[PDB]
Design a protein around this nucleic acid. Structure first.
Ligand SMILES: [Mg+2]
Ligand SMILES: [Zn+2]
Ligand SMILES: [Zn+2]
Lengths: 100, 258, 78, 179, 32, 49, 99, 59, 446, 66, 59, 28, 51, 179, 115, 149
RNA sequence: GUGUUUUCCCCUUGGC
C-alpha cells in the first residue's frame, strides 16, 4: 500500500516499533478492567496473540525483513487493532449450538 | 470502418439441400446466418387442431402433435401470410392461415394407414411435402376406428416451436484444416479429413496461421421440404436483414427521442 | 461505568435495523435525510450509518443488571 | 441413463443454441464431464461409443457384459471406419458464436430414461392454507396443501444463527398463532 | 432367420487372426 | 407435542421444489418459480412512500 | 486399561502415560485431567480423517461435559440429571416422565 | 388365460406380454413377495456371543 | 403482496446439518418450475441437482427480514466458524475451467477479452494493457483474472501439481510449470489456480478475499469468477470421453507386467506360507502375517500401476484436468479407470470364504491367490471378469450399507449434543454461560 | 409407439420411412443398407429407424369394435 | 402380530418394474436392525440373486 | 461333436430355449 | 359473473385461436383455462369471444 | 443339442430335452458348495497349465448372475458397482410403455412415453426381458460437455427443439374411482 | 405448468421497448444498449461488426440470463465518436453486407443452374 | 527517456526442463556486452525462436519515444511515436521481485529482476549496475527484436 | 349477496 521497496534504508525508528507494539498490546482488550484479577486474565486471554505480535513486529524483522516505513507501521498497528476487535466473540452468540 | 464484401459459390444444389461457401464475411455473421436458417426462417406448419372424432389408439394431443410436425410446401405463401397474432380477424382467415381437414374411418379389415395424403388443404399451394417417396404416417387405424379433425396451419418461426424449423440439418464448417487452431487436437493424426480439407494425405493439419481469420464458411442447408433449400437461405438473409432494419428503426427512435 | 463491549454486535444490529425499519413502516418520523428511497429497511440502514436511530439497547448482564447503550454511542461494525 | 447417471434438466436450448458438429448434429442431452470421473461409469462412455458405431453400422451393438469379443479398441477401430474420431470425440462449434470449441467433445447416441420424478408433481407452496383440527398447525403434505416442517434441526440451525425473531415467527407466528 | 445366417457367417469370421490387440484392451484370468 | 408440535412445526409461507443449477445467479440469489412467488405473500405495511 | 497400577510401575513414565478412556482418567486424574483427556480423544477422532474443527467447539463441548465436576453424559441419563428445568428436559427425552 | 393364445388374450383385452404371477384382489394386482427364511429340518450350529452359551445347535 | 424480486428468503436443505444449511437468499423470479441457485452454494447445502429438493421459507415481517439479511444472508456465511475457512468454493466446471484459464499459455484476443469483460460486474471499464503487444494484441488468462480479484488481495498458494523440489532449486520465484500462485495487489502474477487457491481451504484466495474485503465484495468475487470463466469455457470447452481413459500400449504393457509380477509375488508368498517358511510378523498370527504380506504386495501393485497410468496421461487428458483442478475425482479414480480397480474389501478384509473354504464355486478350496479373494486386476476400461465383477459388487455394497447406517446413528449423535448445549451462549459479561447461568468458560474458547 | 414424424435431433422427416424401411428389410437389404437406401446419413436419423419399436401394431390388436 | 407387506400392489410403472416386482425376494430380518451382515452381498448369492438390484434405502 | 468355441451362438441358443420353456415368472 | 364457466376463444393478441374455459372473470380480465396447455392464463376480457 | 435346439418348435425340441438328456442340471446353493464350476469352456477347460482340470459344471453364461433391471445395463462390468445398483433402482422408474393394454387399465398412476425406443446397444439378456418390445427410454445424441454450466452438478442440458419434436414427451394418466 | 409461452422469446410486451440506450458512467463515451427479445443472433453480429470499426475502443454483448430474452451491448468509442453512431453504422453496414450477400447468392443460384 | 536496459542477446537454450506449455517456451539466453543472463517466456506460437537466435532486447519504462509515461490502459488509435514501431515482440508486465546477493553489511553485487508479463515470466540476472532501472512493482515493456546477423 | 372448505390410522413403495 505504501510501496515500501525493501531495498532502500527505512525511516521506521526501532523504538517506534517497540513502543508502538507496547501501546497496541493495550488496545487489544479481552478482559476489561483494571483489577489485578482482570489485568491477569486480560494478559492470559491475549497472551498468544501478544507473543505472536511481538515476534513478528520486532525492531529487527521490521528493519531487516519487512522494511516498513513509519507511515506503513502506523497503518499496520491501526489495522491489527481494527481486525482484532472484529475477532471478538459477539455477546449473544449461541456458541453451544455452534459447537454441537 | 465498414462492412466486408461477402461472396458466394454454390457447390451443389438439389431440391433437398444447398451446399455453398461464403467467403470474406465474418465468423459471427456466418454463424448468425446459420442460426436464422435454424430458428428464424418462417414456414407454414399445423398449429391449431380441432379434433371432432378420434378413436385411434393415440390420444388427441398425440395426433395433434404429429400433425404439427408434418411439413407443408409453403415455398411461396409463407411470404404472403401474416402471423395470425398480427392478423386483424376474429378467427382464422385465408390471409393468415391455411385450413386442413382430415376425415378418415377404417371401414375395412386391413389396417388403414392415415397419412399426410389424407390432410386435405383448402389451398392447393400449401400441401404436405410428401403430397408434392411415401407419405408421413399419422396413425394406423383398426376396423371401425375413425379420426375426423380439421386443423389450421399458420406462419411461425422455428424459434417459436421446432415444427416451424425449415432445415433438416445445417452443416456449418470453417477453416477445414485448422489453420487457425481454434480447435486444438491432442493427437492431430487420429482425426479424419474434413469434406473440404485442402491438405494432402501426408500432413494432418494446416500450419498455424497467426494473422489468419476464419474467412470461408462451408454450408450444407438441408431442407425438411417445407421450403426449397435455396429458399431457406434467401429467406434467412431477408429475415436477418429485416431484424436488423427493425432494430435500426427502434434505435433511431430512441436516439432522436433523447 | 458501562463495562460491555462498545461495538454493536451483529445481533443488536439485526434487531435494531428490523425494529427501526418496522417503526419507519408505521410512519415514524425519520431521523435522516431521505435522498428518495422508500424501503423501510434501506431507511433504517441509512439511519444506522448516520447514527441517528432513536433507540437505546438495554444489555442484560448475567447477574441481572443491565446497561443502556444508545445507538450513536457504540461503534457500528459493518 | 442405464449407468446410474441421473440428473434434472437444468436448461433447454433450442437447436440454434446447442453446439453442433460439422453436420448439423446438435446433442439432445449435454451432461457435465464431472459426472464421470468420480463415478467411473465407463460403461456409459463405452455405451456412447458403441451406440455411435451401431447407429452408423446400422445395427444394434452388443453390450453383454463379459463378452470379450467386444472391447473399446475394437469399437474404436469400427468407429474410425465411418469417418469419425476413433474415440468418439468430435469438433463441435459453439451454437452462440459458431466458433469451434477448442476441446473436441465426446458425443454419441446413449440410451436415456425419463423417470417418473417430474418436477410439477413435486413443486409445492403454502401461504395460510388448511389447518389441522387437533393442533391448529398446517396440514402435512402437498396433496393436503400442507406446510413444510420446520423441524428440530432447523430450530437448531436458527439458534446457531441467533435468529430468535425468525425462530419465533417460524415456530409460532407462522404456524399456530394463538392466545 | 437371416440374423441366424449372419451370426453363423460371423462365427466363421471369428476364425480370422489378428482381430485382437496387444495393448491389453481386455484381460482374463488364467491362474495355476 | 414437545417434539412434533412444539420444537418443530409445519409452517405457513414455505415452498419446496426441485433445485436446478443456475450459474447466472449471484451466490446470494435464489431463482424461484413464478407460481410459488404468486402463492407466497409478504404483508407490507402501507406508507405514503 | 488399569491406569493407576500401570502408572505406578517403575520405568513407566507417570507424566506421559495416558489411557484412551475418559472414565478411567476421571477416577485416577480427576475432572480437569478428564477435560484434557476427553478433548484429546475427541480431537483424535475428528482429525484422524484429516479434517479440522476449531478448538472453540471442542473446548466448549468438553467444558459442558465437565462443568459440574463429574462426567456429564450427553444422554437423558446425563443431561436431564442436570438441573436445567423441566420444560427443557421434556424437549429431549423422558418427556412426560420429567414433567 | 392358461395356455391361451396371443389372439385370444388381445380379444380379452389382456396383454400377451403380461407375465402373470399376481392376484387381482378387489381390482388390485397383488404380488406375493417371496419371503426368505431359515431352512427347516436342518441342524445349524451358531455361536451367540453375549449369552451364557458357547454354542447352540438350532433346529 | 406476492413475493417478488429482491425478497429475502431462508433457503434450506432438510438435512440441516450445520449453520450454513439455512442461508438467506434474495429472490429472483425466473420462468420454469424449480428453485435455481448458483453453484458455489451447493457445497454449503451439500446439494446436487440430481433431483434434490430444497425448502424455501419467506420471513413475514420487517423484523425477521432484517434479521436474516444481517445475520444469515449467504455472503455472511462464506467463512464457517466450525473450521475458520470458506464453506463456499469455486466448484465443478468453473474450477476446471479456471485452472485451464490461468495456465501460462492462455491468450485471448480483444474480441474475446472484451466479451469476457462484459461478464465482469466489478470491471472499472478500462481494458488492461495486454500482456503481449507486438505481433497481435494478446491478453493472458491471468491478466483477465487479475480484474476479477477484488481490491488489493495478497496471497501465495501452490498449484496442486507444484513439484515439492521446486522451492529448493533455482527458478523458485520463476516456476517452470507455472505452479506457485502469487497474487499481489489483487493481480494474479504467477501460478495456475485450482482448489488449493479457489476452493474451500484455509487461506484460499476466496478466504483472503473475505477477510480483506467485505462479504459483499467476496460475493461479487464468487459471481464474477463463475460468470467470466463459464463464458470463456464456451470457447475452451471441456469434455470427457473414451480417449481420456485409454492409455498408451506401452503403458498397458507396463501395467500388465507390474500386475504379473505382483501376482507371481503373491504366489511366492503363498508358497512360503504353504511350506511354513513364512515366519510370522511379531504380534501377528501367521495368517495375519500372510494377509498383511498379500495386502502390501497388492496395494503396491495397484499404486505402481496407478502411477504408471497417471505418468502416461497427456496434459490434454480430461481426467487429469478434472483431477488436478480438484474439480472432481482423484488419482485413484484415474488409476481404477485406466490401470487396475484393485482389491475389493468387505469389512476391511479380502473377500471372505462364503462357500466352504472358497469365495466362489469357480475357485478351488483354499485359493488365497489374488483374484481368488477379490483383487480386480482389470480396469473399468478393460471391464471386469465375472468373478471380479461379483467381488466388486460385494465390495460396493459395503458403501451402500454404511451410507444407510451412517444416517441413523450420526443424527442421534447430533441431536443429543445440541440438546446438551442449546442454551450455552456468550453473555454481555463476555463469559460463556448456560440457561441456569453457570459459567462454562470465562471467555469464549479461552 | 408409432414412428416419430421428425428425427428428434436434426429434423429430417422420418415418419414416412418406416413402412419403406420394413419393405426394404423384406427385400433383405441389410439393416444399414436399408438406411443408406432411404437416405438417412446422420447417425441421429439412423437411430430413429433402428431404435424405433412399432408398438402401435400391437395396440391395434385390441378391438374397440370388431 | 403377523408379518406385514407380504402382498404388495404390483408395480405397473414400467415393464421392467412389473417383471422385477414379480421376481422379488425379501428377507424378514428387521430393518432398523443395525446388523450389516444380513444386508451384505453374500458369496452364495452368485447366480441366484442379482448382485446389483437392491433398494439403496433402508431395505 | 463338441462346440469348437464359436460358442457364443450356442450359449444363447441355450438360455433362449430356457426362457422359451420357463418365462420369467415361472417361480410364481 | 355473466361470463364464467363458458367456453371462449382468444380472438386477439399472442394467444389468438386458443380455446379455453373461463374459470374466473373480472370486468377487466378473464382467467381462461387453456384447452391445450396445462396452464391458466389471465387475459383481457375484450380479447375473448364466446363459442 | 445346439443344432436340435436351433430348429426348436420346428422339431418341438425344448429346454426340457436338454434337462432330460443329462446335459444341463439344476444346481442349488447348497449343492453349489460341492460343484467345481468352470465359467466358460474355452476359458477354463482348455489345456492351459491347469488350474484344476476337475470342473464338474460350467456356467451357461456368466451374465445370468444379473437380475431383470440389472441385465438392462450395457457393459455393467465397466461401471462402478453402486452405479449399477442405482440403475437397477432407476430402471424401475423409467417411463416407457408399461403394458400394451394400457388403454384398458384404469391404473391410478400410469406414465406412457410417446416414442419409447429400443436401445441402440443392448445386453442379449434384455431379449428375454422383452425390453425391445416394451422399451423405456430414447437413444439420444448425448454430448459430454460442460458448455454453459447449467448441466453442472449432476444436471443435463436438453435440446428444446428435440423436445418440441417429442423427445421424451410422455403422458400421465390418473384414474379416480368413486362408487 | 409455470412455463413461459414460447412467443415470449421474440414478442414484445405492451410497454417493453426494443432498445434502450443508457450512458455508462465509469468511462467517457460508453453506452449500454439493452435490446429486448433478442439473442446471440442479433447481438453477436452487431458485436463483431463493431470490432471492425477502428474508432470503437470497446464492443461486446452479453445475455444476462438465458431464461430471459434480453441482451446488453456495451460500446465505447473515441471522444470524437459517440457509440450511438457506432451502433448505427454497425447496423447500417451490416445490413449492406447481408443485402450484398443476398444479391450475390440469388445470382449464384441461377448461375449454378446451367453453370 | 525510459529505456531501462538494452543489450545484444542470444538464445542458448529453450525449455531445458522440457516443454511445459504448447504456445509458451522458456528461453534461456545470454547477453553479450554485459554477459548478463535471461530466462524469458515468449509466446513461441506467434513469435518462434530457436537456440542461437540473436536478438535485441530493450526493456523500457514506456513505449513512447518521447518518454511520456503511459497510464497502463490499453488504447489503440494512437499516432504518438512508440518504441514498439521498431520491434517485433513487445510485452507488458509487472516487475514483481528483485532478488540479489545483498549481505548484512555491504550491498548486492548482482541482482535478478523478475518480471511477469501477464503471467509469462522473465528473470533478468546480472551485475547490479545494469539492473538499477528496475524497482519492484513497476510497469515495463519488453520490446525484443531478432537480429538477422 | 349464497360461497371455501375436508377423515383418520396402519402398512407398503419411492425421492435426496
Ligand atoms: Mg443428490
Ligand atoms: Zn386472418
Ligand atoms: Zn436426424
Amino acid at each position: 500500500i505504501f510501496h515500501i521497496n525493501p531495498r532502500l534504508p527505512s525511516d521506521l525508528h526501532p523504538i517506534k516499533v517497540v513502543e508502538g507494539v507496547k501501546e497496541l498490546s493495550k488496545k487489544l482488550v479481552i478482559v476489561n478492567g483494571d483489577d489485578p484479577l482482570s489485568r491477569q486474565a486480560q494478559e492470559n486471554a491475549t497472551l498468544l496473540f501478544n507473543i505472536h505480535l511481538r515476534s513478528t513486529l520486532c525492531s529487527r524483522r521490521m528493519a531487516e525483513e519487512f522494511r516498513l516505513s513509519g507511515e506503513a507501521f502506523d497503518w499496520l498497528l491501526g489495522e491489527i487493532e481494527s481486525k482484532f476487535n472484529q475477532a471478538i466473540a459477539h455477546p449473544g452468540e449461541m456458541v453451544g449450538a455452534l459447537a454441537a | 470502418p465498414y462492412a466486408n464484401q461477402p461472396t458466394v459459390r454454390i457447390t451443389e444444389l438439389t431440391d433437398e439441400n444447398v451446399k455453398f461457401i461464403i467467403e470474406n464475411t465474418d465468423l459471427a455473421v456466418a454463424n448468425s446466418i446459420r442460426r436464422v436458417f435454424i430458428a428464424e426462417v418462417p414456414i407454414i406448419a399445423i398449429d391449431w387442431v380441432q379434433i371432432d372424432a378420434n378413436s385411434s389408439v393415440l390420444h388427441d394431443e398425440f395426433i395433434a402433435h404429429r400433425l404439427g410436425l408434418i411439413p407443408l410446401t409453403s415455398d411461396d405463401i409463407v411470404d404472403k401470410l401474416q402471423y395470425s397474432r398480427d392478423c386483424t380477424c376474429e378467427e382464422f382467415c385465408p390471409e393468415c392461415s391455411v385450413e386442413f381437414t382430415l376425415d378418415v374411418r377404417c371401414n375395412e379389415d386391413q389396417t388403414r394407414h392415415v397419412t399426410s395424403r389424407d390432410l386435405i388443404s383448402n389451398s392447393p399451394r400449401v400441401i404436405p411435402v410428401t403430397s408434392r417417396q411415401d407419405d408421413i404416417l399419422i396413425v394406423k387405424l383398426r376396423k371401425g376406428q375413425e379420426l375426423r379433425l380439421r386443423a389450421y396451419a399458420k406462419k411461425g418461426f422455428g424459434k417459436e416451436h421446432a415444427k416451424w424449423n425449415p432445415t433438416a440439418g445445417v452443416a456449418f464448417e470453417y477453416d477445414p484444416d485448422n489453420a487457425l487452431r481454434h480447435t486444438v487436437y491432442p493427437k492431430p493424426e487420429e482425426w479424419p479429413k474434413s469434406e473440404y480439407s485442402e491438405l494432402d494425405e501426408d500432413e494432418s493439419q494446416a500450419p498455424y496461421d497467426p494473422n489468419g481469420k476464419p474467412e470461408r464458411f462451408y454450408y450444407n442447408v438441408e431442407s425438411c421440404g417445407s421450403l426449397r433449400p435455396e429458399t431457406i437461405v434467401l429467406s434467412a438473409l431477408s429475415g436477418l436483414k429485416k431484424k436488423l432494419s427493425d432494430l435500426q428503426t427502434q434505435l433511431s427512435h430512441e436516439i432522436q427521442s433523447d | 461505568k458501562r463495562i460491555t463491549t462498545p461495538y454493536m454486535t451483529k445481533y443488536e444490529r439485526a434487531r435494531v435495523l428490523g425494529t427501526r425499519a418496522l417503526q419507519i413502516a408505521m410512519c415514524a418520523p425519520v431521523m435522516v435525510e431521505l435522498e428518495g428511497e422508500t424501503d423501510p429497511l434501506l431507511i433504517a440502514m441509512k439511519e444506522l450509518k448516520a447514527r441517528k436511530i432513536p433507540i437505546i439497547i438495554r444489555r442484560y448482564l448475567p447477574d441481572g443488571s443491565y446497561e443502556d447503550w444508545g445507538v450513536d454511542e457504540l461503534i457500528i461494525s459493518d | 441413463s442405464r449407468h446410474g447417471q441421473k440428473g434434472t434438466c437444468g436448461i433447454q436450448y433450442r437447436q440454434e443454441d446447442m453446439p453442433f458438429t460439422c453436420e448439423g448434429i446438435t446433442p439432445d442431452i449435454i451432461i457435465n464431464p464431472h459426472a464421470i470421473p468420480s463415478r467411473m461409469t465407463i460403461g456409459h462412455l463405452i455405451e456412447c461409443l458403441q451406440g455411435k458405431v451401431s447407429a452408423n453400422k446400422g445395427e444394434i451393438g452388443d453390450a453383454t457384459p463379459f463378452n470379450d469379443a467386444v472391447n473399446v479398441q475394437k469399437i474404436s477401430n469400427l468407429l474410425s471406419d465411418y469417418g469419425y474420431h476413433l474415440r468418439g470425440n468430435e469438433v463441435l462449434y459453439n451454437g452462440f458464436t459458431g466458433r469451434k470449441i477448442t476441446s473436441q467433445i465426446f458425443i454419441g447416441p446413449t440410451y436415456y430414461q425419463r423417470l417418473k420424478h417430474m418436477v410439477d408433481d413435486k413443486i409445492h407452496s403454502r401461504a395460510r392454507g388448511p389447518i389441522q383440527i387437533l393442533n391448529r398447525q398446517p396440514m402435512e403434505g402437498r396433496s393436503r396443501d400442507g406446510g413444510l416442517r420446520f423441524g428440530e434441526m432447523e430450530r437448531d440451525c436458527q439458534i446457531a444463527h441467533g435468529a430468535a425473531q425468525f425462530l419465533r415467527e417460524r415456530l409460532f407466528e407462522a404456524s399456530d398463532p394463538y392466545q | 432367420e437371416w440374423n441366424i445366417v449372419e451370426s453363423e457367417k460371423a462365427l466363421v469370421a471369428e476364425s480370422h487372426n489378428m482381430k485382437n490387440q496387444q495393448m491389453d484392451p481386455f484381460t482374463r484370468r488364467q491362474c495355476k | 407435542r414437545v417434539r412434533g408440535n412444539l420444537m418443530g412445526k409445519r409452517v405457513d409461507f414455505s415452498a419446496r421444489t426441485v433445485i436446478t443449477p443456475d450459474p447466472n445467479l449471484s451466490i446470494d440469489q435464489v431463482g424461484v418459480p413464478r407460481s410459488i412467488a404468486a402463492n407466497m405473500t409478504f404483508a407490507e405495511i402501507v406508507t405514503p412512500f | 486399561v488399569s491406569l493407576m497400577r500401570v502408572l505406578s510401575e517403575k520405568d513407566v513414565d507417570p507424566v506421559r502415560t495416558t489411557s484412551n478412556d475418559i472414565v478411567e482418567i476421571f477416577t485416577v486424574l480427576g475432572i480437569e485431567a478428564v477435560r484434557k483427556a476427553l478433548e484429546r480423544e475427541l480431537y483424535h477422532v475428528i482429525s484422524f480423517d484429516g479434517s479440522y474443527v476449531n478448538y472453540r467447539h471442542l473446548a466448549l463441548l468438553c467444558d459442558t461435559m465437565t462443568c459440574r465436576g463429574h462426567l456429564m453424559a450427553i444422554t437423558r441419563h446425563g443431561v436431564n440429571r442436570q438441573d436445567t428445568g423441566p420444560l427443557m428436559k421434556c424437549s429431549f427425552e423422558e418427556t412426560v416422565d420429567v414433567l | 388365460l392358461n395356455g391361451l393364445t396371443d389372439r385370444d388374450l388381445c380379444e380379452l383385452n389382456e396383454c400377451p406380454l403380461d407375465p402373470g404371477g399376481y392376484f387381482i384382489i378387489n381390482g388390485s394386482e397383488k404380488v406375493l413377495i417371496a419371503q426368505e427364511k431359515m431352512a427347516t429340518n436342518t441342524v445349524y450350529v451358531f455361536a451367540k456371543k453375549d449369552s451364557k452359551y458357547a454354542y447352540t445347535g438350532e433346529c | 403482496r406476492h413475493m417478488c424480486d429482491g425478497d429475502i428468503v431462508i433457503f434450506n436443505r432438510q438435512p440441516t446439518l450445520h449453520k450454513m444449511s439455512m442461508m438467506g437468499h434474495r429472490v429472483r423470479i425466473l420462468p420454469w418450475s424449480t428453485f435455481r441457485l448458483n453453484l458455489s452454494v451447493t457445497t454449503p447445502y451439500n446439494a446436487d441437482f440430481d433431483g434434490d429438493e430444497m425448502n424455501l421459507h419467506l420471513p413475514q415481517s420487517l423484523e425477521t427480514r432484517a434479521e436474516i439479511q444481517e445475520l444469515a444472508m449467504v455472503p455472511r456465511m462464506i467463512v464457517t466458524p466450525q473450521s475458520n475457512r470458506p464453506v463456499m468454493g469455486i466448484v465443478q466446471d468453473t474450477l476446471t475451467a479456471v485452472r485451464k484459464f490461468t495456465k501460462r499459455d492462455v491468450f485471448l484476443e480483444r474480441g474475446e477479452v472484451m466479451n469476457l469483460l462484459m461478464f465482469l460486474s466489478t470491471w472499472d471499464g478500462k481494458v488492461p494493457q495486454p500482456a503481449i503487444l507486438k505481433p497481435r494484441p494478446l491478453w493472458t488468462g491471468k491478466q483477465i483474472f487479475s480484474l476479477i480479484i477484488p481490491g488489493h488481495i495478497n496471497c501465495i498458494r501452490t498449484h496442486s501439481t507444484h513439484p515439492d523440489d521446486e522451492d529448493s532449486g533455482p527458478y523458485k520465484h520463476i516456476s517452470p510449470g507455472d505452479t506457485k500462485v502469487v497474487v499481489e495487489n489483487g493481480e494474479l502474477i504467477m501460478g495456475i489456480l485450482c482448489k488449493k487457491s479457489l476452493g474451500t481451504s484455509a487461506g484460499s484466495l476466496v478466504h483472503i478475499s473475505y477477510l480483506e474485503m467485505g462479504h459483499d465484495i467476496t460475493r461479487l468475487f464468487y459471481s464474477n469468477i463463475q460468470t467470466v470463466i463459464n463464458n470463456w469455457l464456451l470457447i475452451e470447452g471441456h469434455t470427457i470421453g473414451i480417449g481420456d481413459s485409454i492409455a498408451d500400449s506401452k503403458t498397458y504393457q507396463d501395467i500388465q507386467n507390474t500386475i504379473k509380477k505382483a501376482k507371481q509375488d503373491v504366489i511366492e508368498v503363498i508358497e512360503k506360507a504353504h511350506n511354513n517358511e513364512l515366519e510370522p510378523t511379531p504380534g501377528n498370527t501367521l495368517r495375519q502375517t500372510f494377509e498383511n504380506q498379500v495386502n502390501r504386495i497388492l496395494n503396491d501393485a495397484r499404486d505402481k500401476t496407478g502411477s504408471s497410468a497417471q505418468k502416461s496421461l497427456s496434459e490434454y487428458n480430461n481426467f487429469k484436468s478434472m483431477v488436478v483442478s480438484g474439480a472432481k475425482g482423484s488419482k485413484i479414480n484415474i488409476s481404477q479407470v485406466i490401470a487396475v480397480v484393485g482389491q475389493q474389501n468387505v469389512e476391511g478384509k479380502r473377500i471372505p470364504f462364503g462357500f466352504k473354504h472358497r469365495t466362489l464355486p469357480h475357485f478351488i478350496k483354499d485359493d488365497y491367490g489374488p483374484e481368488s479373494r477379490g483383487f480386480v486386476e482389470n480396469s473399468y476400461l478393460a471391464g471386469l471378469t465375472p468373478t471380479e465383477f461379483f467381488f466388486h459388487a460385494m465390495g460396493g455394497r459395503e458403501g451402500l450399507i454404511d451410507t444407510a447406517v451412517k444416517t441413523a446413528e450420526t443424527g442421534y449423535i447430533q441431536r443429543r449434543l445440541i440438546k446438551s448445549m442449546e442454551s450455552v451462549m456468550v453473555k454481555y459479561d463476555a463469559t460463556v454461560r448456560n440457561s441456569i447461568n453457570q459459567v462454562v468458560q470465562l471467555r469464549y474458547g479461552e | 409407439m408409432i414412428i416419430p414424424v421428425r428425427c428428434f435431433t436434426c429434423g429430417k422427416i422420418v415418419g414416412n420411412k418406416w413402412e419403406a424401411y420394413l419393405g426394404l428389410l423384406q427385400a433383405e437389404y441389410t439393416e444399414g443398407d436399408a438406411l443408406d437406401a432411404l437416405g438417412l446419413k446422420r447417425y441421429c436419423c439412423r437411430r430413429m429407424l433402428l431404435a424405433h419399436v412399432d408398438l402401435i401394431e400391437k395396440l391395434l390388436n385390441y378391438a374397440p369394435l370388431e | 402380530q403377523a408379518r406385514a407387506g407380504v402382498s404388495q400392489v404390483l408395480n405397473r410403472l414400467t415393464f421392467a418394474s412389473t417383471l422385477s416386482h414379480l421376481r422379488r425376494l425379501n428377507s424378514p430380518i428387521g430393518r432398523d436392525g443395525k446388523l450389516a451382515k444380513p444386508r451384505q452381498l453374500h458369496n452364495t448369492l452368485w447366480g441366484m440373486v442379482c448382485p446389483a438390484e437392491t433398494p439403496e434405502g433402508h431395505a | 461333436e463338441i462346440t469348437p468355441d464359436l460358442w457364443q451362438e450356442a450359449c444363447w441358443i441355450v438360455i433362449s430355449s430356457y426362457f422359451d420353456e420357463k418365462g420369467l415368472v415361472r417361480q410364481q | 359473473n355473466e361470463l364464467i364457466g363458458q367456453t371462449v376463444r382468444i380472438s386477439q393478441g399472442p394467444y389468438k385461436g386458443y380455446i379455453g374455459v373461463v374459470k374466473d372473470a373480472t370486468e377487466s380480465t378473464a382467467r381462461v383455462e387453456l384447452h391445450s396447455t396445462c396452464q391458466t392464463i389471465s387475459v383481457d376480457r375484450q380479447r375473448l369471444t364466446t363459442v | 443339442h445346439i443344432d436340435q435346439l436351433k430348429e426348436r418348435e420346428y422339431n418341438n425340441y425344448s429346454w426340457q430335452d436338454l434337462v432330460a438328456s443329462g446335459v444341463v442340471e439344476y444346481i442349488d446353493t447348497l449343492e453349489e458348495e460341492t460343484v467345481m464350476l468352470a465359467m466358460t469352456p474355452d476359458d477354463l477347460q482348455e489345456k492351459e497349465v491347469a488350474y484344476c482340470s476337475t470342473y464338474t459344471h460350467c456356467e451357461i453364461h456368466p451374465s445370468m448372475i444379473l437380475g431383470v433391471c440389472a441385465s438392462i445395463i450395457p457393459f455393467p462390468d465397466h461401471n462402478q458397482s453402486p452405479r449399477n445398483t442405482y440403475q437397477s433402482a432407476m430402471g424401475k422408474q423409467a417411463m416407457g410403455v408399461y403394458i400394451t393394454n394400457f388403454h384398458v387399465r384404469m391404473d391410478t398412476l400410469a406414465h406412457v412415453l410417446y416414442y419409447p425406443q429400443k436401445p441402440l446397444v443392448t445386453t442379449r439378456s434384455m431379449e428375454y426381458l422383452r425390453f425391445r418390445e416394451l422399451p423405456a427410454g430414447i437413444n439420444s445424441i448425448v454430448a459430454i460437455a460442460s458448455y454453459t454450466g447449467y448441466n453442472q452438478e449432476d444436471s443435463v442440458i436438453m435440446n428444446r427443439s428435440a423436445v418440441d419434436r417429442g423427445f421424451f414427451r410422455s403422458v400421465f394418466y390418473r384414474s379416480y374411482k368413486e362408487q | 405448468m409455470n412455463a413461459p409461452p414460447a412467443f415470449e422469446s421474440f414478442l414484445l410486451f405492451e410497454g417493453e421497448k426494443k432498445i434502450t440506450i443508457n450512458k455508462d458512467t465509469k468511462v467517457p463515451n460508453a453506452c449500454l444498449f439493452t435490446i429486448n427479445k433478442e439473442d446471440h443472433t442479433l447481438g453477436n453480429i452487431i458485436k463483431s461488426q463493431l470490432l471492425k470499426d477502428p474508432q470503437v475502443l470497446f464492443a461486446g454483448y452479453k445475455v444476462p440470463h438465458p431464461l430471459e430474452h434480453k441482451i446488453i451491448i456495451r460500446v465505447q468509442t473515441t471522444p470524437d465518436y459517440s457509440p450511438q453512431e457506432a451502433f448505427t453504422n454497425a447496423i447500417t453496414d451490416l445490413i449492406s453486407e447481408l443485402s450484398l450477400l443476398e444479391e450475390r447468392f440469388r445470382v449464384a443460384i441461377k448461375d449454378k443452374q446451367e453453370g | 527517456a525510459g529505456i531501462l536496459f538494452e543489450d545484444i542477446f542470444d538464445v542458448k537454450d529453450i525449455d531445458p526442463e522440457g516443454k511445459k506449455f504448447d504456445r509458451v517456451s522458456r528461453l534461456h539466453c545470454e547477453s553479450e556486452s554485459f554477459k548478463m543472463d535471461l530466462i524469458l517466456d515468449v509466446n513461441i506460437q506467434i513469435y518462434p525462436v530457436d537456440l542461437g537466435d540473436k536478438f535485441r532486447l530493450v526493456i523500457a519504462s514506456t513505449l513512447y519515444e518521447d518518454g511520456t509515461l503511459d497510464d497502463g490502459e490499453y488504447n489503440p488509435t494512437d499516432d504518438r511515436p512508440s518504441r514498439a514501431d521498431q520491434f517485433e515482440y513487445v510485452m507488458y508486465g509487472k516487475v514483481y521481485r528483485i532478488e540479489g546477493d545483498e549481505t548484512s553489511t555491504e550491498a548486492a553485487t548482482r541482482l535478478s529482476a523478475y518480471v511477469s508479463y501477464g503471467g509469462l515470466l522473465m528473470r533478468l540476472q546480472g551485475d547490479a549496475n545494469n539492473l538499477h532501472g528496475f524497482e519492484v512493482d513497476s510497469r515495463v515493456y519488453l520490446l525484443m527484436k531478432k537480429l538477422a546477423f
